[PDB]
């Protein structure tokens, strides 16, 4: 479904030798709490010597966007697996939320490179709003000044199967 | 596996089914292309094949190694008494083809043409075209209206003619009736020509001329049921052949598990409609002289 931003913070199991472990935190986009904990444990296994049995999760909190109703450019650094090897890439997308931003990021990854959520890692998602910082033409073309354009060839959906006059695609 | 040695197929695949023609008289399948500039004229004629004979003529072929010398040629003489035109039909062009709109006949119909319309002519009341002539037999009763219909419609005009079987030496007494397209002038001109020529003779000296290439349409001589050897020209099987040698040895492979349409089979030979083209008229002559 639509992803949700979670902060998941957990530690290794406190032993007698070393109480109060380092309390590692992660920001991850997942469908819900179960997949959030799963992804947190997967990444913490990829990074540090700890597994789910040997550790615990001390907190998992959803993070709502500070302002979900303003347009901001998003720079997403990701790494993904292809049929041949692993590649890092950087994309920029115009969107109103980080969660919707990773929604479109995953959709575009699947569309353009056949990469699945299985194969995609989101390294970083950064909100930006400065022009001349975005590097992609398919974003700068909308960040141009006084952007107005028509929508040629409007197609109107019909409920009935039969229409009694030829359609007009004006707008 | 492949044939050990290649050879052309026996017979023509465009001339089958080798079945009997639907009638003794072979109709013109396609008339010559219509031209409106040229005057209205018959595109065909009906004759009777009289026989064959020999002619001697000086060949004029400027470049042959044996040019300007006498040659002997075989010619076919056909008896062509002037065909009596009576009747005219109209054809409108439709998304389905040429559809016959109406046919208008003439006042008097010949006894021979009525015999053509009949089967048991002698034991009959001879009631044919009687009420048609009653609708006719006036100046403008109802035939001029049909003429106007053929003028307003019927992009193709075909006159109806019948042969003079009484003039010919045949013992038939039954006229042959056919349609001839008029490939000149507008539809109005075609209909006017047909009406003026209603109930009268057209001469082949007016239709065709000397030094002309024409097409003969006829039903070939019938030969009945025939085997493959003479029907298609297949090889005769060797002398030491059990249960027959005038046959096709292999009539198909194991697969497809069917005899194919292209395999030569015994059946009817002759009596097929045929249109031979490019026959040069060597003479158009009349019998009203020696």
């Amino acid at each position: 479904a639509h992803f949700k931003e979670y902060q998941v913070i957990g530690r290794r199991l406190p032993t007698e030798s070393v109480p109060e472990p380092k309390l590692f935190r992660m920001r991850i986009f997942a469908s819900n709490e179960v997949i959030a904990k799963s992804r947190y444990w997967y990444f913490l296994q990829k990074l540090h010597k700890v597994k789910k049995a040997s550790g615990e999760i001390v907190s998992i909190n959803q993070i709502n966007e500070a302002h979900p109703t303003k347009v901001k450019n998003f720079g997403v650094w990701v790494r993904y697996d292809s049929r041949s090897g692993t590649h890092n890439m950087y994309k920029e997308i115009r969107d109103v939320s980080r969660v919707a931003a990773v929604e479109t990021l995953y959709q575009d990854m699947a569309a353009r490179h056949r990469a699945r959520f299985r194969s995609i890692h989101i390294l970083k998602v950064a909100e930006i709003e400065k022009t001349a910082d975005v590097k992609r033409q398919y974003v700068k073309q909308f960040l141009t000044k006084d952007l107005k354009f028509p929508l040629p060839h409007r197609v109107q959906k019909s409920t009935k199967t039969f229409s009694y006059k030829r359609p007009s695609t004006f707008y | 596996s492949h044939r050990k040695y290649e050879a052309p197929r026996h017979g023509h695949l465009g001339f089958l089914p080798r079945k009997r023609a639907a009638s003794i008289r072979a109709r013109v399948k396609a008339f010559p292309k219509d031209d409106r500039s040229k005057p209205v004229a018959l595109t065909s004629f009906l004759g009777y094949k009289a026989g064959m004979t020999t002619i001697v003529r000086d060949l004029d072929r400027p470049g042959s190694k044996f040019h300007k010398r006498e040659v002997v040629e075989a010619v076919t003489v056909v008896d062509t008494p002037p065909v009596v035109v009576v009747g005219v039909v109209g054809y409108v062009e439709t998304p389905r083809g040429l559809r016959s709109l109406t046919t208008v006949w003439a006042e008097h119909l010949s006894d021979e043409v009525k015999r053509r319309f009949y089967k048991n002519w002698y034991k009959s009341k001879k009631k044919a075209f009687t009420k048609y002539s009653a609708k006719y037999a006036q100046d403008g009763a109802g035939i001029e209206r049909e003429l106007a219909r053929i003028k307003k419609y019927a992009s193709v005009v075909r006159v109806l003619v019948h042969t003079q079987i009484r003039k010919t030496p045949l013992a038939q007494k039954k006229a042959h009736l056919a349609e001839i397209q008029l490939n000149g002038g507008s539809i109005s001109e075609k209909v006017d020509w047909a009406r003026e020529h209603f109930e009268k003779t057209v001469a082949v000296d007016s239709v065709f001329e000397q030094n002309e290439m024409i097409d003969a349409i006829a039903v070939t001589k019938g030969h009945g049921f025939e085997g493959v050897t003479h029907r298609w020209g297949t090889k005769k099987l060797p002398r030491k052949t059990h249960r027959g040698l005038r046959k096709v040895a292999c009539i198909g492979a194991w697969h497809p598990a069917h005899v194919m349409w292209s395999v030569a089979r015994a059946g009817q030979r002759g009596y097929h409609s045929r249109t031979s083209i490019n026959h040069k008229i060597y003479r158009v002559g009349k019998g009203d002289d020696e």
Partner: protein, 191 residues
């Protein structure tokens, strides 16, 4: 990629007028009128100041922007044809057999007839499209000139001459014989 807006500008001379319906454009000036149907490209036109026409493509791909460039170039070519006109000069190049080029008129159709190319009995016949005039230029020999209003028509006539004058069954690098497009320019060039 889907470039949101691609706009281009075509200038018109002061002595020419352009009428643009849906996608059928006519241009009329000193040398006459030319017409073009562009109903296969989906490009919008606008007038700026009676001397500038903007040609626009919205949400177009690479092919669509290429088509926008093509339509701008085509309308430019037709405008310069209506103003100055096009002239294609061709040379006959032969090694041994002089190429005899003349103009015949069957029912007034203005055919071009080529004889003696490589000493053959062939008669190479080329129809002349409308709006194309054939002149055998003086002060120079084995020269033909096709002058017209439509660059496409004059160039296709010249290409027809080249295609008939193509040589067969021989090494072309030795048998360079043929009628070749030497010059393509304007009738009002350097005027």
């Amino acid at each position: 990629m889907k470039y949101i807006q691609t706009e281009q500008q075509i200038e018109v001379p002061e002595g020419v007028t352009v009428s643009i319906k849906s996608r059928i454009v006519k241009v009329v000036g000193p040398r006459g009128t030319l017409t073009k149907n562009l109903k296969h490209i989906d490009v919008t036109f606008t007038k700026v100041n009676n001397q500038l026409i903007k040609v626009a493509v919205h949400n177009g791909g690479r092919k669509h922007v290429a088509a926008l460039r093509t339509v701008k170039s085509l309308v430019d070519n037709m405008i310069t044809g209506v103003t100055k006109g096009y002239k294609y000069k061709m040379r006959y190049v032969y090694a041994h057999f002089p190429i005899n080029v003349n103009i015949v008129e069957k029912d007034g159709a203005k055919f071009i007839e080529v004889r003696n190319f490589l000493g053959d009995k062939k008669i190479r016949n080329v129809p002349v499209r409308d709006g194309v005039t054939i002149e055998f230029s003086t002060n120079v020999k084995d020269e033909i000139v096709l002058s017209g209003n439509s660059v496409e028509d004059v160039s296709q006539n010249a290409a027809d001459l080249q295609q008939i004058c193509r040589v067969r069954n021989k090494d072309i690098r030795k048998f360079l014989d043929g009628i070749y497009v030497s010059h393509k320019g304007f009738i009002t060039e350097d005027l």
